[PDB]
Amino acid sequence: SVQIVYKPVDLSKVTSKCGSLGNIHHKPGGGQVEVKSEKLDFKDRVQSKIGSLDNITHVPGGGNKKIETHKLTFR
Amino acid sequence: SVQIVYKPVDLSKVTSKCGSLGNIHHKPGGGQVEVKSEKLDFKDRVQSKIGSLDNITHVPGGGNKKIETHKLTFR
Amino acid sequence: SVQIVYKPVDLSKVTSKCGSLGNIHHKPGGGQVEVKSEKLDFKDRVQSKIGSLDNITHVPGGGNKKIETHKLTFR
Amino acid sequence: SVQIVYKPVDLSKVTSKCGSLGNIHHKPGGGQVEVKSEKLDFKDRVQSKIGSLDNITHVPGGGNKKIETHKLTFR
Amino acid sequence: SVQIVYKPVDLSKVTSKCGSLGNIHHKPGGGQVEVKSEKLDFKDRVQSKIGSLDNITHVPGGGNKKIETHKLTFR
């Protein structure tokens, strides 16, 4: 027989502090993209970006990414 | 028989502090991209970017990435 | 029989502090990229970037990367 | 029978401090890249970058990378 | 029978301090890259960069890399 016990306890404190951020300036001068093709054939979990100019400004006022996985397989 | 015990306890404190960040300036002059092809064929978990100019400004006001995995296989 | 005991306890303190960061300037003059091909065929966990000019400014106001893995296989 | 005991306890303090960073200037003049090919065929965990000019400014306001792995195989 | 005991305790203090960093200037004049080929065939954990000019400025405001592995195989 099997006695399987899983009981992790993960405690954490994650902190970010800032007085002020500041005058952030993002001022790009755009260019150009040219794409030439004939045929595309795709499938089954595919992600794609063809031909783009995406200017992104991301200024979270402090932040955190916390990722946790608990994965069990019993065969 | 099996007695399997899993009980990790991971405690942590992660800290980031800053008075102020400052006047961050991002000012690119864009260029050009040219892509020439005929056929594309793709599948099964593929990620792609073809032909792009993505100017990204990312200024989190301090931050953390905390990644944890607990993976068990019992055959 | 087996008596398997796993109980790590990892405690840590990770700290980053700064008064102010400063006036960071990022001002690239863009160039050009030309890619010529005929056929692409790809699959099964592939990541690719073809033809790009990505100017990235990343200024986290201090930060940390903490990665932990607990992996067990019992055959 | 087996008595297997795993109980590491790793304690640490990792610190980075700075008064101010300063006026960091990144000002590249872009060039050019030309790639000519006919066919590509690839698969199974492949990462690639073909034809790029990625200017990256990374100024974390102090930081740390802490990586830990606990891996056990019981056959 | 086996009595296997693993209980390392590694304590450490890692510190980096600086008053100010200074006015760091990175100002490259770009060149050119030309790559000519016909066919590529690749697979199974391969990483590659073909044809690139990546100018990178990295100024962490002090920092540390701490890597630890605990690996056990019981046959």
Add this chain to the structure above:
Amino acid sequence: SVQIVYKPVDLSKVTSKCGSLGNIHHKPGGGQVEVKSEKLDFKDRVQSKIGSLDNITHVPGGGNKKIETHKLTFR
């Protein structure tokens, strides 16, 4: 007694012939221009261009310039 005879007689043929010109393509990317000053004091036939991106295409279907000056003094 002053006798002045001015009688240039200048006959000419200026010719330009052409079957066809062709598919002219002009496709410039962008860029950035920044100018700072305090005071401008301009007097008496002052011509200037300050701060500009003027991209032009000029395709005359053949052309010629013929310029003549006939200037006489009488003192």
Add this chain to the structure above:
Amino acid sequence: SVQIVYKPVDLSKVTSKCGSLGNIHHKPGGGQVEVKSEKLDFKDRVQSKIGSLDNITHVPGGGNKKIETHKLTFR
């Protein structure tokens, strides 16, 4: 007694012939220009261009310039 006879007689043929020109391609990338000053004082026939990116394509379908000056003194 002064007798002046001015009678140049200049006959000419200026010719340009062409079947076709061709597919001219002009595709420049970008760039960045920055100029700083305080005071400008310009007087009496001053011509200038300050701070610019002027990309031009000039494709006349053949052309010629014929310039003549006929200048006489009388003192």
Add this chain to the structure above:
Amino acid sequence: SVQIVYKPVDLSKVTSKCGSLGNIHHKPGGGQVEVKSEKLDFKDRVQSKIGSLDNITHVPGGGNKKIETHKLTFR
């Protein structure tokens, strides 16, 4: 008694022939220009270009310049 006879007679043929020119490609990358000064004082026929990136394509379908000066003194 002064007798002056000015009678140049200059006959000429200036010719340019061409089947076709060809597929001319002009594809420059970018760059960066930075200029700093305080005071400019320009007087009496001053011509200047300060701080610029002027990329040009000039493809006349054949051409010629014919310049003549006929200048006479009378003192």
Add this chain to the structure above:
Amino acid sequence: SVQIVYKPVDLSKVTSKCGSLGNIHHKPGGGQVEVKSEKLDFKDRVQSKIGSLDNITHVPGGGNKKIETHKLTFR
């Protein structure tokens, strides 16, 4: 008694022939130029270029320059 006869008679043929020119490719990379000064004082026929990247392509379909000066004194 002064008798002056000026009668040059100059006949000429200037010829340029060509089947075709060819596929001329001009593809320069970038670069960086930096200039610092305080005061400029320019007077009386001053011509200058300060701080520039001028890349040009000049492909006349054949051409010629014919220049003549006929200058006479009368003192």
Add this chain to the structure above:
Amino acid sequence: SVQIVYKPVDLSKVTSKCGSLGNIHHKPGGGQVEVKSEKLDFKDRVQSKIGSLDNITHVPGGGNKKIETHKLTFR
């Protein structure tokens, strides 16, 4: 009694022939130029180029220069 006869008679043929020129390729890389000064004082026919990267391609489809000066004194 002064008798002056000026009658040069100069006949000429200047010829350039060509089947085709060829595929001329000009592909320079970049570089960096830096100039520092304080005061410039320019007077009376001053021509200058300060701080520049001028890359040019000049491919005339054959060409010639014919220059003549006919200058006479009368004192």
